[PDB]
Write a protein that binds this ligand. Structure first.
Ligand SMILES: Cc1ncc(C[n+]2csc(CCOP(=O)(O)OP(=O)(O)O)c2C)c(N)n1
Ligand SMILES: Cc1ncc(C[n+]2csc(CCOP(=O)(O)OP(=O)(O)O)c2C)c(N)n1
Ligand SMILES: [Ca+2]
Ligand SMILES: [Ca+2]
Lengths: 811, 808
């Protein structure tokens, strides 16, 4: 569970000291200096004679405009953390203000502690200016390479979903979530405001949304800055916030006056948050209006007002760099020099080039520092789940009635297993669902917890399995469910979410961003300890969206995940739940795993169980296994065709083909693939089957009929250097189907049992088998026509049970 | 340009007639009956004795919950259309409400006109009930197979972005956009509300957002129905709307009282909209507060209140079917029977089983009808653009100074072309961008038009190229820009939008849904005329996101688009602008095309021009071409290695390697690829190169070093059955990068000129050249180290120019 840190939710009951405000002004000035320094200077960090164009970097890379805003807020939060003892994690929505985040870590000690080459002196300061956005150095964004970051803010939108995910089951945590006014125009951000009706002020922590209303994005004004202030206040009140507005920097107000006004406001907001936390110990069933801050300041605040006659402070022109070159001319250099000097850095550094003690007297210390809080390195907090014994959930009927038994919905097994995981691991595991948890059959969870809901209740006849506190959360937003969970994993907890397969694509770019976070982490951030895996149950899949139709038929998250399977990072897993027992096998593996995105493709429709838990655990360890109990060939040399499947529905259609081939006395091998990446090039992936193991399973020379769950392109591109790759006949989804019958969905994509039988005969001998093939094709047309006439499927398709099932026995 | 249809923005100046309201109530009842009928009945549409469980469908497919509220709004909108002559297109957010849409088109005559087997009698009604969500039949959603749909609503969120796109440069058009209250929880919808400060009430039409506040989604309440009414109204007011709220169905109020309250409310809202349209002819610089309607009715309205002792009307339980089976028992069939009879069909149908004249007297007529308005079949409005002469934008310098000239930003060329397409086609063409138009270099457009901004103006020192009216729109939302444009295309207009390549993935799922829309259309909807193409400029790409870092480095939109390339549909284009000329070649083709998504991948970084417009146009027609002027081999037998590239940067590094292999006198073919899909199996894609043409270009039997823009898996999967496929050595992006130098970006992905030369040498003979291979590998490290020391790239990299150029 989340640890309690410091003294949470304490009022100051005293005004902020003048001496501490002086510290903030100094932090502000030095953080600006270090920010400009990282963008502009390759050398000579303290500007000692001779200070020249040779000291400036050749290409300017990085973003000023947001940075002085961020540096002002982070200074005042640091003051706040130290005076109060508050467990604080920030979310920098504008992750392109990465200089503010590196500056914070350098000034709080965590940078030097983590990178000992980057010392607190002139030499270290020069290394630090240089390395920013620089070949062999560090990113331009608040990247995972930065102490205090759980949010890079490269792809904008996820500021508020991440903030709200971080505070769940984290009642000591406070998250000032800084949101760009451009980022507020994105869809994911717009709906993230609404998260305040899915958290509880007693069992969850608190988010203080801060709107960085600097008036501009790259090249345009922001919508929220150019509407009336009355509209802006109403909008935030209507979304269940008590909005406060701070305006500064548009006039001649002295910097100390601004600091006084801001600390006074901030303490007022904090007093209101402390009243909320205090009330919540008594009454947590009444949703309060959570404070939020509208921070209205000119973009690029404290850069030159005009440069070469164009307004730069309080404009979009300050967004990247207000001054496009300091090398090209002397007058441009003159502006950089005067700009850096306006911060009077002779008052901020000692003669060693260390920051003076009175610039940092006010800073927090130890684990309260933004860079050091374990919430921002959640791996240090994370423990292994207490897993119940997998064998308790095994479908046993396979062991006694035979392979292919039953009409079970596989996901109900993951449902029961996950339920007991929540019971044994309370406050450490969450399920998220875009109004689909029960549709994907995971509602066994409601037996030990509730959907968490902090909007209105009206009636026991409709408000079932909801409570103001609980470990299932639903909102109809794939962005919120991915967001919440990601932050939940990043602050050191566990969980899963499910989605209908086609709508996973809604959050393809979040999967990309979270993969990239994990890629950089496992490659070059050994101090960032492993977090729990992002477990995604991909259900209600293409082959059984016959009832919703073509809009819902897109299994291609598989193709998108394959684009993050490089470098032996091993941050992606892609599993095909053959049946409920293989679903358990995959669930154990993913629930124990760390630093991954696990995509678990599994059907909720009634389907046969093929494997015992033992056979499934064994098949999963290698990724593909031959099925000697289903093969009629005794070894590879006797086999005329290999039948291979990846996916519950292709396994079903391949095993019903197998039975038709057995009755014609064909000699076939049956292969099953649970782990897509097992087939990847052994040159590319050191966990894949070797060519030796590949050749043995799939044979070196015999024709392979491969029925794949998703698009053939996936498998064909994976196996390009494998033995016998030219003999793979891959069937998959081909952008066909409609509102139709289960048989029609497989038929129209040329993966039904009859076409697979036909295909197997074609591959052995078209001439020898020409007759049976024609019979098989006419039956396909006949089976379709049966559906059109009757409105359900042919009994050959419906009433089929694998020959291996002892159906004599009344079970 | 959009047509003016009917008599727009007309007040009634009279109460709604008692007789129209009675028509409306009959529309609601029959429409509900047709709706339940489609979900539950295989036969006996009018329940003529004997009426048994043999008449009910075995598998119930479809959604009742939303459907009665939809049938109510559309009855009332039908009344309003006829009484006012208002050009009206509806957006059914809750697309799962398919039955309200099919019912609409049956009742207005467009269904029987489009589908003549579906007659206005017992026999047709039997076909109409059965075919719904039935094998052989029609979809469960407001699909493109339905007259009146420009919006399926299968994937929720896109209701307001499509609504607002439809009304742009469409001043006579009115779009009531029906938004689910579940759908309002999605991100794309949340931001769509704000579209009201990007439209002008004089040059654009009007959207009336309608929140279907029915209190529930599948298995949960909705946030927006369980917050205070005060918070709900502040929320809409703060997004610049005048919220109006209608509550009905929670008590015993009689249907006719409900209809009267509703029409009166609807006309009061209509008057306010007409005042806004009249004001806008004099003052169109002050943004009005646009009405919206909060519609609060019980989910499943008019279904049985309780079923098996569980609450069904005003519950999530009504979402799909309130009554799970009608065949399992007689008690369940009895419930179905009683429910159908509650509507009193005996009053609605004559003995032929045609709908009675006095049910449809109130309905609009001709092109004012929801199913026949040409805005909902925009291909009939669509005209070919007046394109300017491509030759006028040619980079002519290639012809004078040679292949490899200059350091031009290619996208500036597409920017000039597009500017003049706007000048020649005013009100027919729009650019959208997510705060990136200028960054992607399309700002030549500002020479003839402005960014359209209907929020506040403060100062000429910051408000450059903005006007309350204009053909460029920007909001920082990929969903909005994709949304606006889709609707703009579907109502018969043209355009383009640009994104940074990594952030195209934000809208992967929208390209999926549009692709599927087009896929359904070219296959089986010949009455839906072709629309203009969704043209997406994919720029600021992976190889030159070295100033922003790993977050901006994902070119895998290519992999996603390849998943919509089957059945010879030809609804996807994937193109790589080799240079500005090849970009013009691709733009012309894309701007003349219909029924496509076109992904145009082009660099905005300074880069060489390789091709004349003529060689560009000839290369593009085939999709790939040998570059004989760059090859040293003069036929394929004489060739030792083939150098292939797709992408401005791969092309650059392959042409630099070619110059390095020329110095060693290797005999190599150079191939450029501009159209990814030309490589697709000839058995799969009938527009692709033949095996003949493929083996001629790439050779039958020699080693091919292919440098690819995106992920090598793309190509490896495309060419599985091409001859000589096993000799393809494919390098592409490999999830390596950082914020670094151009050289470092290609180096760390093994696509830099030096590695590509080495790899060519390895593939001809690793021993012969081992010395020269090894030297190349050390220069890679030397070149990296240079950049670390100096902070800019080694001049062998920086300063190179193709031997083919005159540098004197
Ligand atoms: C989803 C997405 N689209 C586009 C971009 C490109 N981009 C980066 S910064 C930016 C403007 C953001 O402005 P704002 O949120 O106002 O931040 P600030 O002004 O504080 O820099 C844009 C469009 C992005 N990072 N993410
Ligand atoms: C993006 C997306 N996520 C999830 C779904 C699954 N889904 C289908 S309809 C629906 C509920 C929508 O409820 P609402 O919008 O309130 O419609 P209504 O109550 O009018 O039926 C859900 C979750 C979807 N279609 N699209
Ligand atoms: Ca901003
Ligand atoms: Ca609803």
């Amino acid at each position: 569970t989340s640890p309690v840190i410091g003294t949470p939710w304490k009022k100051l009951n005293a005004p902020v000291s003048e001496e501490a405000l002086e510290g903030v002004d100094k932090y502000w000035r030095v953080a600006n200096y270090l920010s400009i320094g990282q963008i502009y200077l390759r050398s000579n960090p303290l500007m000692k004679e001779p200070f020249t164009r040779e000291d400036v970097k050749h290409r300017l890379v990085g973003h000023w405009g947001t940075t002085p805003g961020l540096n002002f807020l982070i200074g005042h939060i640091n003051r706040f953390i130290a005076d109060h003892g508050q467990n604080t994690v920030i979310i920098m929505g504008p992750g392109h203000g990465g200089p503010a985040g590196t500056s914070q870590s350098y000034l709080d000690g965590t940078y030097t502690e983590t990178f000992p080459k980057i010392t607190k002196d002139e030499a270290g300061l020069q290394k630090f200016f240089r390395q920013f956005s620089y070949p062999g150095g560090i990113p331009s964004h608040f990247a995972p390479e930065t102490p205090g970051s759980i949010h890079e803010g490269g792809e904008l939108g996820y500021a508020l979903s991440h903030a709200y995910g971080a505070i769940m089951d984290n009642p000591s945590l406070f998250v000032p979530a800084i949101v760009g006014d451009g980022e507020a125009e994105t869809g994911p951000l717009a709906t993230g405001w609404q998260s305040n009706k899915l958290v509880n002020p007693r069992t969850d922590g608190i988010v203080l949304p801060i709107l960085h209303l600097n008036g501009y994005k790259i090249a345009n004004p922001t919508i929220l800055s150019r509407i009336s202030d009355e509209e802006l206040h109403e909008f935030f009140h209507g979304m269940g916030y008590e909005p406060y507005e701070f305006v500064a920097g548009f006039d001649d107000e002295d910097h100390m006056s601004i600091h006084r006004r801001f600390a006074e406001l901030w303490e007022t907001i904090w007093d209101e948050i402390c009243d909320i936390k205090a009330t919540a110990q008594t009454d947590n069933v009444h949703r309060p209006f959570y404070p939020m801050l509208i921070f209205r300041t000119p973009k690029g605040w404290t850069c030159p007002k005009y440069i070469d006659g164009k307004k730069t402070e309080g404009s979009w022109r300050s967004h990247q760099v207000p001054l496009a070159s300091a090398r090209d001319t002397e007058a441009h250099f003159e502006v950089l020099k005067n700009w850096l000097e306006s911060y009077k850095p002779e008052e901020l550094f000692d003669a060693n080039g260390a920051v003076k003690d009175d610039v940092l007297a006010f800073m927090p210390k130890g684990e309260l520092r933004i860079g050091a809080n374990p919430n921002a390195n959640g791996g240090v907090i994370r423990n292994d789940l207490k897993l119940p014994n997998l064998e308790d959930y095994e479908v046993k009927e396979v062991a006694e009635y035979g392979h292919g038994w039953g009409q079970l919905e596989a996901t109900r097994t993951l449902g029961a297993y996950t339920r007991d995981i929540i019971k044994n691991n309370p406050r450490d595991f969450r399920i998220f669902g875009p109004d689909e948890t029960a549709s994907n059959r995971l509602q066994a969870s409601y037996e030990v917890t509730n959907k968490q809901w902090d909007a209105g209740y009206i009636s026991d006849e409709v408000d079932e399995h909801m409570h103001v506190s609980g470990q299932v959360v639903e909102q109809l937003s794939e962005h919120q469910m991915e967001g919440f969970l990601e932050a939940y994993l990043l602050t050191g907890r566990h969980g899963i979410w499910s989605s209908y397969e086609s709508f996973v694509h809604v959050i393809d770019s979040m999967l990309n961003q979270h993969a990239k976070w994990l890629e950089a982490t496992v490659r070059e951030i050994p101090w960032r300890k492993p977090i729990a895996s992002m477990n995604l149950l991909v259900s209600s899949h293409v082959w059984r969206q016959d009832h919703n139709g073509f809009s819902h038929q897109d299994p291609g998250v598989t193709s998108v995940l394959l684009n993050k399977c490089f470098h032996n990072d091993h941050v992606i897993g892609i599993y095909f739940a053959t049946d409920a027992n293989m679903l358990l096998a995959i669930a154990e593996k993913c629930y124990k795993s760390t630093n991954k995105i696990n995509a678990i493709i599994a059907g909720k429709q009634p389907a046969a169980t093929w494997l015992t838990l033992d056979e499934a655990r064994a098949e999963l360890e290698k990724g593909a296994a031959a099925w000697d109990w289903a093969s009629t060939a005794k070894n590879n040399d006797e086999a005329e065709v290999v039948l291979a499947a990846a996916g519950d529905v292709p396994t079903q259609e391949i095993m019903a083909a197998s039975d038709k081939l057995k009755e014609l006395g064909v000699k076939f091998k049956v292969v099953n693939v649970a782990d897509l990446l097992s087939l990847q090039s052994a040159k590319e992936n050191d966990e894949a089957l070797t060519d030796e193991e590949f050749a043995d399973i799939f044979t070196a020379d015999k024709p392979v009929l491969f029925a794949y769950h998703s698009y053939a392109h996936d498998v064909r591109g994976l196996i390009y250097d494998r033995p016998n790759h030219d003999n793979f006949n891959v069937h998959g989804y081909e952008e066909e189907g409609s509102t139709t019958t289960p048989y029609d969905m497989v038929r129209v994509n040329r993966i039904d049992r009859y076409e697979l039988t036909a295909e197997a005969l074609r591959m052995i001998d078209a001439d020898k088998y020409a007759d049976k093939i024609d019979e098989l094709e006419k039956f396909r047309d006949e089976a379709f026509q049966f559906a059109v006439d009757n409105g359900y499927d042919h009994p050959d398709y419906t009433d089929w049970v694998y020959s291996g099932v002892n159906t004599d026995k009344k079970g």
